[PDB]
């Protein structure tokens, strides 16, 4: 049965969910794991899953009486759609994908992503625990000069309330995170210090995979998801 | 130019937004004011404004290139739709309606109502201040035995953050609110004590209008909205 | 075996019945012949075995005044929250028995309502405490209100909101205890189960009863004692 | 004429430049020949004209111990929050001048970051204070961060979230002051304007400057002095 990594973002946009999501795909592909991808775009466009897509799906489903005359809502009707859609895709490569990485676009706290964050809150409990993961990418600012953790505290705090607890907390730095600083992120985000990852400003994006690998993200995933 | 009363709900459903919304319509109609109604149903059905209705509107608008190839979102695209829709209806009776009462269905905090609460947050600033109102209906529980205010504090607190400050706070009691208790609701909800209204368990729904009238809701509205 | 902690917290309204629940958990565990101890925390400034805000602040205030924090800035977090955990640890250890062994379980009643300013230090205190003492030995009961208007259906919103809030503050209930007037339908408690993160078996109904003494009986009937044994690996 | 209050609060990150802004508002008003006074509040336990948490708690603790609350339960709210308002009132009144008239304006620097546990009593204190002293005489500046990643656009989310939070805690900024590295586009500040509830003219840019002494000049250039005269009806 499918293994899932969800990648959510906090604090701001342009934080690098794309790069971490691909990097995690690449590190995983390089263990003989057949990995696959879903990009969720919370925007209303019908053009990979979008809000308009899943809404129009449910909207005309109702319009032809699939819901039997009773009132259709975000929970469970939209949220089920999203969860079913995810599972259909996780299967598409003729050997099936073993792990699936879900890039959730937008930022946690956004109104557009509320349905999607709720869908996955429900989904972690549907699939087993050993089959679902949550990587939260957040900004650790630093004006020259100490590295500031509160934005990530609050972001992780928000996501916890919305029902997901991050399993790694990947932090966008400029200079690497000091031990003390990620030990502080640990204190407040519930993960252990090794599960706080700094992806600092590397001069090129091909490093991010190596930057992830060497902070033990390969090893963690195998243990966390149970993987050959 | 149109005057608007928005009626939102807090704490629980079945609180009586329907009854207060109609009562306010009735008290207002009985001053030679031509009053009109919008019922917003945050549910996905396309059958008075609903989520499915406003989404399908925007969805196929985009699908025929009205939005010029750029990404459509809840803010401003859905929220504009909602605001424009509201104004079109406020005009439909051949003398035009002077005041319009918007029943916002669901409960504040719900994911389904987030777009609608944001639409009106923006709308209060679009129309003038003397043309827009917000009535928040909340539960004041009481197990036999003191009347409990926190649910309303938190509900009003939530709505304030989401960008609307209530102008009256109508409280569903079983027994009338004690002066001290609505003086406490005043302390935390920013309104003055006279703007806290208790609509307690009356033996019939035709009293609610009289219950509202005698707590000065007629007089307040004239002053708050500037009305003949 | 190491100390086991049961934290009782309240949501939605005060006077929801924390104290009674706290006492009933104490009684029903004690009934198994466990050696149970009890700690009350009032989040008020008034200055045992009964912690209060003023008691804790004065403690940390005095320490700082006497140099104990080595001239560093002293703060609600970590310094007040450290004091709250230190105190709970110490009291929990004191005997309360026929003869002097450490208690096996300590039921903590936290006053106030989740979300209140006055209870924020305490929730945070215990958010950290659950990781210090391992989660195997920590356990949180959240008492909430399920209104039932005659305008027939049993409302779960307040519980949903209160447990979202508590979650975000960093504690996720192990048992959700609902005060309501009639007993909850299975579906209503499967809905709470869904939204909070507990199995339906861990949504406990405490409906209107003839006497407060029927409440420990209500709890036993809904399998709580067996829950705590399984959950905190008690004998 | 009656005392005028300017409250400076911080969001998103600490070290965002509250103190500098607070000082610059003091300087630029003083430059108009107003008699301005300054109050610092550190939300720490360490025990002027400089309020601290331990100072306030010890105050209320002592009072209760000596019976001043007539045997009633004493709480963060209203009792600590009463103390914070009482103190601000008293200090604000003390002269700071060539000769002894009451100050015309009092700039209050609140330490901490909106959302922190340690600052909750204070925000609440001032939520109530704005209605006691009328809103005509009360005025809140919120300093926030606007990150600018090279991955070109100036980010408003953190400000949006921080002002939602502050709003909900019961203060709505009159001026939003953005720390960022370059100056903000008009559109970026119209966006903040939209989300928070201020006109674009009241979104103030404080970008990277050669010296801290250029910051009062930055403020004057963006019309703040004229804002405060209009907003607090000062001469």
From Swiss-Prot, chains C, D:
Entry's localization field: Cytoplasm, Cytosol
Superkingdom: Eukaryota
Residues where N6-acetyllysine is found: 63
Reported tissue expression: Widely expressed.
Induction: Up-regulated in T-cells and B-cells activated through the TCR and the BCR respectively (at protein level).
Family classification: Belongs to the CTP synthase family.
Known disease link: Immunodeficiency 24: A life-threatening immunodeficiency, characterized by an impaired capacity of activated T and B cells to proliferate in response to antigen receptor-mediated activation. Patients have early onset of severe chronic viral infections, mostly caused by herpes viruses, including EBV and varicella zooster virus (VZV), and also suffer from recurrent encapsulated bacterial infections, a spectrum of infections typical of a combined deficiency of adaptive immunity.
Function: This enzyme is involved in the de novo synthesis of CTP, a precursor of DNA, RNA and phospholipids. Catalyzes the ATP-dependent amination of UTP to CTP with either L-glutamine or ammonia as a source of nitrogen. This enzyme and its product, CTP, play a crucial role in the proliferation of activated lymphocytes and therefore in immunity.
Entry protein name: CTP synthase 1
């Amino acid at each position: 049965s499918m293994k899932y990594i969800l990648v959510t973002g906090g604090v701001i946009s342009g934080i690098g969910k794309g790069i971490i999501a691909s990097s995690v795909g690449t590190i995983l592909k390089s263990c003989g794991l057949h990995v696959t991808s879903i990009k969720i775009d919370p925007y209303i466009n019908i053009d990979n899953l979008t809000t308009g897509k899943i809404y129009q799906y449910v909207i005309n489903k109702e319009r032809k009486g699939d819901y039997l005359g009773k009132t259709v809502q975000v929970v469970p009707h939209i949220t089920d759609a999203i969860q079913e859609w995810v599972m259909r895709q996780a299967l598409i490569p003729g050997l099936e994908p073993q792990v699936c990485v879900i890039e959730l676009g937008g930022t946690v706290g956004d109104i557009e992503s509320m349905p999607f964050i709720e869908a996955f809150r429900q989904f972690q409990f549907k699939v087993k625990r050993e089959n679902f993961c949550n990587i939260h990418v957040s900004l650790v600012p630093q004006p020259s000069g100490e590295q500031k953790t509160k934005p990530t505290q609050n972001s992780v705090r928000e996501l916890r309330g919305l029902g997901l607890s991050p399993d790694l907390v990947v932090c966008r730095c400029s200079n690497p995170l000091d031990t003390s600083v990620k030990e502080k992120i640990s204190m407040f985000c519930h993960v252990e210090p090794e599960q706080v990852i700094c992806v600092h400003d590397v001069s090129s994006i091909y490093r991010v995979p190596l930057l992830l690998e060497e902070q033990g993200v390969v090893d963690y995933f195998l243990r966390r998801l149970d993987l050959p």
